[PDB]
Scaffold this active site. Structure first.
Site, PDB file in Angstrom:
ATOM      1  N   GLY A 183       7.903   0.769   2.176  1.00  0.00           N
ATOM      2  CA  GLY A 183       8.684   0.765   0.952  1.00  0.00           C
ATOM      3  C   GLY A 183       9.996   1.516   1.122  1.00  0.00           C
ATOM      4  O   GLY A 183      10.489   2.160   0.186  1.00  0.00           O
ATOM      5  N   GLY A 184      10.567   1.473   2.320  1.00  0.00           N
ATOM      6  CA  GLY A 184      11.865   2.089   2.506  1.00  0.00           C
ATOM      7  C   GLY A 184      11.922   3.594   2.308  1.00  0.00           C
ATOM      8  O   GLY A 184      13.025   4.143   2.185  1.00  0.00           O
ATOM      9  N   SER A 242       6.471  -1.653   7.864  1.00  0.00           N
ATOM     10  CA  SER A 242       7.849  -1.358   7.436  1.00  0.00           C
ATOM     11  C   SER A 242       8.083   0.140   7.569  1.00  0.00           C
ATOM     12  O   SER A 242       7.919   0.678   8.676  1.00  0.00           O
ATOM     13  CB  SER A 242       8.064  -1.937   6.030  1.00  0.00           C
ATOM     14  OG  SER A 242       9.440  -2.158   5.692  1.00  0.00           O
ATOM     15  N   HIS A 264       9.100 -10.588   5.447  1.00  0.00           N
ATOM     16  CA  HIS A 264       8.721  -9.179   5.527  1.00  0.00           C
ATOM     17  C   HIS A 264       7.588  -8.860   4.558  1.00  0.00           C
ATOM     18  O   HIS A 264       7.685  -9.134   3.352  1.00  0.00           O
ATOM     19  CB  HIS A 264       9.952  -8.332   5.204  1.00  0.00           C
ATOM     20  CG  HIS A 264       9.789  -6.869   5.463  1.00  0.00           C
ATOM     21  ND1 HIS A 264       9.648  -6.346   6.733  1.00  0.00           N
ATOM     22  CD2 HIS A 264       9.821  -5.806   4.625  1.00  0.00           C
ATOM     23  CE1 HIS A 264       9.573  -5.028   6.662  1.00  0.00           C
ATOM     24  NE2 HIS A 264       9.682  -4.671   5.396  1.00  0.00           N
ATOM     25  N   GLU A 315      11.749 -11.872   9.035  1.00  0.00           N
ATOM     26  CA  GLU A 315      11.879 -10.509   8.515  1.00  0.00           C
ATOM     27  C   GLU A 315      13.058 -10.344   7.566  1.00  0.00           C
ATOM     28  O   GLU A 315      12.980  -9.563   6.612  1.00  0.00           O
ATOM     29  CB  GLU A 315      12.052  -9.527   9.669  1.00  0.00           C
ATOM     30  CG  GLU A 315      10.891  -9.459  10.636  1.00  0.00           C
ATOM     31  CD  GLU A 315       9.751  -8.596  10.110  1.00  0.00           C
ATOM     32  OE1 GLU A 315       9.804  -8.205   8.911  1.00  0.00           O
ATOM     33  OE2 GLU A 315       8.813  -8.302  10.904  1.00  0.00           O
ATOM     34  N   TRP A 328       4.390  -5.705  -5.277  1.00  0.00           N
ATOM     35  CA  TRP A 328       4.801  -4.502  -4.576  1.00  0.00           C
ATOM     36  C   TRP A 328       5.046  -3.308  -5.492  1.00  0.00           C
ATOM     37  O   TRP A 328       5.153  -2.191  -4.987  1.00  0.00           O
ATOM     38  CB  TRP A 328       6.057  -4.802  -3.750  1.00  0.00           C
ATOM     39  CG  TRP A 328       5.824  -5.941  -2.801  1.00  0.00           C
ATOM     40  CD1 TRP A 328       6.433  -7.162  -2.818  1.00  0.00           C
ATOM     41  CD2 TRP A 328       4.904  -5.962  -1.686  1.00  0.00           C
ATOM     42  NE1 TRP A 328       5.939  -7.950  -1.798  1.00  0.00           N
ATOM     43  CE2 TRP A 328       4.999  -7.238  -1.091  1.00  0.00           C
ATOM     44  CE3 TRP A 328       4.009  -5.024  -1.139  1.00  0.00           C
ATOM     45  CZ2 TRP A 328       4.228  -7.606   0.034  1.00  0.00           C
ATOM     46  CZ3 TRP A 328       3.238  -5.391  -0.036  1.00  0.00           C
ATOM     47  CH2 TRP A 328       3.356  -6.670   0.542  1.00  0.00           C
TER      48      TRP A 328
HETATM   49  C1  LIG Z   1      14.470  -2.023  -3.623  1.00  0.00           C
HETATM   50  N1  LIG Z   1      13.053  -2.039  -4.196  1.00  0.00           N
HETATM   51  C2  LIG Z   1      13.205  -1.632  -5.669  1.00  0.00           C
HETATM   52  C3  LIG Z   1      12.462  -3.499  -4.116  1.00  0.00           C
HETATM   53  C4  LIG Z   1      12.085  -1.000  -3.466  1.00  0.00           C
HETATM   54  C5  LIG Z   1      12.071  -1.224  -1.868  1.00  0.00           C
HETATM   55  O1  LIG Z   1      11.334  -2.114  -1.479  1.00  0.00           O
HETATM   56  N2  LIG Z   1      12.919  -0.342  -1.176  1.00  0.00           N
HETATM   57  N3  LIG Z   1      12.828  -0.644   0.199  1.00  0.00           N
HETATM   58  C6  LIG Z   1      13.884  -0.416   0.950  1.00  0.00           C
HETATM   59  C7  LIG Z   1      13.772  -0.777   2.422  1.00  0.00           C
HETATM   60  C8  LIG Z   1      14.711  -0.323   3.348  1.00  0.00           C
HETATM   61  C9  LIG Z   1      14.574  -0.681   4.696  1.00  0.00           C
HETATM   62  C10 LIG Z   1      13.524  -1.489   5.133  1.00  0.00           C
HETATM   63  C11 LIG Z   1      12.623  -1.924   4.158  1.00  0.00           C
HETATM   64  N4  LIG Z   1      12.733  -1.590   2.835  1.00  0.00           N
HETATM   65  C1  LIG Z   2       7.635  -3.496  -0.256  1.00  0.00           C
HETATM   66  N1  LIG Z   2       7.246  -3.972   1.134  1.00  0.00           N
HETATM   67  C2  LIG Z   2       5.845  -3.413   1.418  1.00  0.00           C
HETATM   68  C3  LIG Z   2       7.190  -5.484   1.165  1.00  0.00           C
HETATM   69  C4  LIG Z   2       8.208  -3.487   2.246  1.00  0.00           C
HETATM   70  C5  LIG Z   2       9.721  -3.477   1.712  1.00  0.00           C
HETATM   71  O1  LIG Z   2      10.142  -2.373   1.419  1.00  0.00           O
HETATM   72  N2  LIG Z   2      10.294  -4.767   1.688  1.00  0.00           N
HETATM   73  N3  LIG Z   2      11.633  -4.736   1.240  1.00  0.00           N
HETATM   74  C6  LIG Z   2      12.034  -5.667   0.385  1.00  0.00           C
HETATM   75  C7  LIG Z   2      11.084  -6.739  -0.148  1.00  0.00           C
HETATM   76  C8  LIG Z   2      10.885  -6.900  -1.552  1.00  0.00           C
HETATM   77  C9  LIG Z   2      10.016  -7.886  -2.040  1.00  0.00           C
HETATM   78  C10 LIG Z   2       9.345  -8.717  -1.152  1.00  0.00           C
HETATM   79  C11 LIG Z   2       9.589  -8.510   0.217  1.00  0.00           C
HETATM   80  N4  LIG Z   2      10.428  -7.559   0.730  1.00  0.00           N
HETATM   81 ZN   LIG Z   3      11.983  -2.320   0.762  1.00  0.00          ZN
END
Ligand SMILES: C[N+](C)(C)CC(=O)N/N=C/c1ccccn1
Ligand SMILES: C[N+](C)(C)CC(=O)N/N=C\c1ccccn1
Ligand SMILES: [Zn+2]
Ligand SMILES: *[C@@H]1O[C@H](CO[C@@H]2O[C@@H](C)[C@@H](O)[C@@H](O)[C@@H]2O)[C@@H](O[C@@H]2O[C@H](CO)[C@@H](O)[C@H](O)[C@H]2NC(C)=O)[C@H](O)[C@H]1NC(C)=O
Ligand SMILES: *[C@@H]1O[C@H](CO[C@@H]2O[C@@H](C)[C@@H](O)[C@@H](O)[C@@H]2O)[C@@H](O[C@@H]2O[C@H](CO)[C@@H](O)[C@H](O)[C@H]2NC(C)=O)[C@H](O)[C@H]1NC(C)=O
Ligand SMILES: *[C@@H]1O[C@H](CO)[C@@H](O)[C@H](O)[C@H]1NC(C)=O
Ligand SMILES: *[C@@H]1O[C@H](CO)[C@@H](O)[C@H](O)[C@H]1NC(C)=O
Ligand SMILES: *[C@@H]1O[C@H](CO)[C@@H](O)[C@H](O)[C@H]1NC(C)=O
Ligand SMILES: *[C@@H]1O[C@H](CO)[C@@H](O)[C@H](O)[C@H]1NC(C)=O
Ligand SMILES: [Cl-]
Ligand SMILES: [Cl-]
Ligand SMILES: [Cl-]
Ligand SMILES: [Cl-]
Ligand SMILES: [Cl-]
Ligand SMILES: [Cl-]
Ligand SMILES: [Cl-]
Ligand SMILES: [N+]
Ligand SMILES: [Zn+2]
Length: 527
Positions: A114-115, A196, A436, A323, A80
């Site tokens: 990616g939030g 996401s 997720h 999830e 990721w």
């Molecule tokens: C935290 N990290 C460095 C792995 C980046 C990331 O994945 N930030 N993502 C936040 C988020 C918030 C709500 C729903 C899904 N993702």
């Molecule tokens: C980054 N991604 C596309 C999976 C969405 C996201 O922000 N996910 N949030 C946390 C996470 C971190 C590592 C593996 C799975 N989920």
């Molecule tokens: Zn995330």
């Protein structure tokens, strides 16, 4: 050697060998003026014409972002992480064309999640050349600004108005509208899809008037704007913006003169101060997210949805079975990707404090009360799975179901799925189930590559999903019509039918998380 004449100038692609055939790829086409100097925090500016041949033969820079590091050397977190340089010069997009050049092909436009803090379109599991090759659609993906540089809000102030990343996306949608024809695409047949925060993005595009005419249909994978993490209100947007200024020593009185202070700070100064704009974060915290700006968003989205103020079209919406488990190993006590994460009642109680920090003691007791009526009171993983279901039901599933009910109540066809297959190649431990983000590779048809050592059942399921996505994009109906598949029924708010997707059997069910979602969507707001 193929070169396409865009409205902005000539661009040179490259040819790829996929499954015994060819796909033409245009990686890294610029679609905006680079947002740096005085253009930082601003809406994306239009692209200046050029008179040479742009070589769109490699992925572009990724947008500035903070990188995951909780597991260095671990593929499960590092797949990721960005795989091109980070730079503010990052507004580029990619186009996969089938070969030979189609006539009037349906375009799919991917928006990564990616939030709203991280992400890039160059990731391997977002490679659109399989979809181009197998379903003869065109796949487009873009990079959009994230974190503070993409969502810093001083509302009303044009120097930092909020929602810049969403305008980046929209400007890329504008691009395939003005240009996709020269690639053989049909600007009138454009399907947004994302996962996401990318799915939350496309749900906001259903609401933004400026996006109404830039696409046709929409696919929402594991996210919607009504998810608790997805929209930041105006008073937290401002407390966050002003906290970051105090952190960088950019506290000025003239509102505008705070911004020019941040505009002369280096990108890494803003990045390492981003985490501390909220006093109590959670693993789900979105420090700089979408806001009601009066431009992209004209009013609060929950009001728009409830009163039918959105683009009327078909939608495809769905979630994965586990999830919430990804977030547990990033915070909850007793959790680890390296053991079975069996926790006690006590540890379950302290996880709820992590995920619901400013919620009452009576609030947290009701969560525990709903999620602890076991079939077997002797199962040692009871509390582990229960805290995973709590986080997944609250942050993804129940919002997604509520989005689909309210959207469909205004007459459009909606299709809901429940992905419950765990990838044979998934590098996380088994207790974390169908995590997720880990339907994406099936959607993009990666198991269609036999060398990749996916299972044979996985090639079939990916092939069937790839067909259902492209049938939805082309014809507004996600059927697989030839191999006697299960027919996917419309999601009606009365009966709430959905399709489970998996290797063994795709069956039709009703009222996914019936009880859990009544609690989260009707009771839990009042506590
Ligand atoms: C935290 N990290 C460095 C792995 C980046 C990331 O994945 N930030 N993502 C936040 C988020 C918030 C709500 C729903 C899904 N993702
Ligand atoms: C980054 N991604 C596309 C999976 C969405 C996201 O922000 N996910 N949030 C946390 C996470 C971190 C590592 C593996 C799975 N989920
Ligand atoms: Zn995330
Ligand atoms: C609005 O923001 C204030 C500011 O908090 C600080 O802002 C930055 C300087 C950064 O360093 C943050 O991490 C700081 O927390 C919040 O005030 C703090 O609130 C916490 C508990 O909520 C308290 O323990 C701190 O003492 C407060 N800090 C100060 C300087 O008073 C405030 O909570 C935010 N608004 C709301 C409604 O919570
Ligand atoms: C599962 O593992 C977690 C992870 O913490 C471990 O701590 C290291 C010392 C090492 O043993 C690694 O394998 C792990 O990363 C355990 O939680 C920890 O437990 C210890 C002892 O009780 C405690 O001191 C730590 O603070 C805990 N850390 C966290 C983050 O919770 C957990 O106890 C293990 N449970 C099972 C059932 O194996
Ligand atoms: C673009 O690619 C062609 C083919 O390799 C090359 O000849 C040309 O000089 C390149 N233009 C650049 C790098 O500006
Ligand atoms: C593409 O399809 C649209 C209808 O969806 C039609 O109006 C248009 O003329 C077609 N163009 C080409 C080049 O086939
Ligand atoms: C300061 O504030 C005024 C209005 O309050 C505004 O017109 C001006 O552009 C701001 N910045 C500078 C550098 O004057
Ligand atoms: C349908 O079945 C054939 C025969 O096995 C297979 O080759 C093809 O890929 C299948 N199509 C889909 C969409 O599953
Ligand atoms: Cl053909
Ligand atoms: Cl107990
Ligand atoms: Cl107790
Ligand atoms: Cl287990
Ligand atoms: Cl096999
Ligand atoms: Cl089937
Ligand atoms: Cl209740
Ligand atoms: N249920
Ligand atoms: Zn289940």
């Amino acid at each position: 050697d193929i070169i396409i004449a865009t409205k902005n100038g000539k661009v040179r692609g490259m040819q790829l060998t996929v499954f015994g055939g060819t796909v033409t790829a245009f990686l890294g086409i610029p679609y905006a003026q680079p947002p740096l100097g005085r253009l930082r925090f601003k809406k994306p500016q239009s692209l200046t014409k050029w008179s040479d041949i742009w070589n769109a033969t490699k992925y572009a820079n990724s947008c500035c972002q903070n990188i995951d590091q909780s597991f260095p050397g671990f593929h499960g977190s590092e797949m990721w992480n960005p795989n091109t340089d980070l730079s503010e010069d990052c507004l580029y997009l990619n186009v996969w064309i089938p070969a030979p050049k189609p006539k009037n092909a349906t375009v799919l436009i991917w928006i990564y999640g990616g939030g709203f803090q991280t992400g890039t379109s160059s990731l391997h599991v977002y490679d659109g050349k399989f979809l181009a090759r197998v379903e003869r659609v065109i796949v487009v993906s873009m990079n959009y600004r994230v974190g503070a540089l993409g969502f810093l809000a001083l509302p009303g102030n044009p120097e930092a108005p909020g929602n810049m990343g969403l305008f980046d996306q929209q400007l890329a949608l504008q691009w395939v509208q003005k240009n996709i024809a020269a690639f053989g695409g049909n600007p009138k047949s454009v399907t947004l899809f994302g996962e996401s925060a990318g799915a939350a993005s496309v749900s906001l595009h259903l609401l933004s008037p400026g996006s109404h005419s830039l696409f046709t249909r929409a696919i929402l994978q594991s996210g919607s704007f009504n998810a608790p993490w997805a929209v930041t209100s105006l008073y937290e947007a401002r407390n966050r913006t002003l906290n970051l200024a105090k952190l960088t020593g950019c506290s000025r009185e003239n509102e505008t003169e705070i911004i020019k202070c941040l505009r002369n700070k280096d990108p890494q100064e803003i990045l390492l101060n981003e985490a501390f704009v909220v006093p109590y974060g959670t693993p789900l915290s979105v420090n700089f997210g979408p806001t009601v700006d009066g431009d992209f968003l004209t009013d609060m989205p929950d009001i728009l949805l409830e009163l039918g103020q959105f683009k009327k079209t078909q939608i495809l919406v769905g979630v994965n079975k586990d999830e919430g488990t990804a977030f547990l190993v990033y915070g909850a006590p007793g959790f680890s990707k390296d053991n079975n994460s069996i926790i006690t009642r006590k540890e379950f109680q302290e996880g709820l404090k992590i995920f619901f920090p400013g919620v009452s003691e009576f609030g947290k007791e009701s969560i525990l009360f709903h999620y602890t009526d076991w079939v077997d009171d002797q199962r040692p993983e009871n509390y582990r799975e229960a805290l995973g279901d709590v986080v997944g039901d609250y942050n993804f599933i129940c919002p997604a179901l509520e989005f689909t009910k309210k959207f469909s109540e205004w007459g459009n066809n909606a299709f809901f799925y429940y992905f419950e297959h765990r990838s044979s190649k998934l590098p996380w431990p088994e207790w974390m189930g169908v995590m997720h983000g880990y339907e994406i590779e099936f959607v993009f048809g990666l198991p269609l590559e036999r060398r990749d050592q996916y299972t044979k059942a996985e090639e079939i399921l990916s092939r069937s999903i790839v067909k259902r996505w492209a049938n939805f994009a082309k014809y507004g109906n996600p059927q697989e019509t030839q191999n006697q598949s299960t027919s996917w029924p419309v999601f009606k708010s009365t009966e709430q039918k959905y399709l489970t997707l998996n290797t063994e059997s795709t069956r039709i069910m009703t009222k996914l998380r019936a009880q859990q979602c009544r609690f989260w969507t009707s009771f839990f707001p009042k506590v």
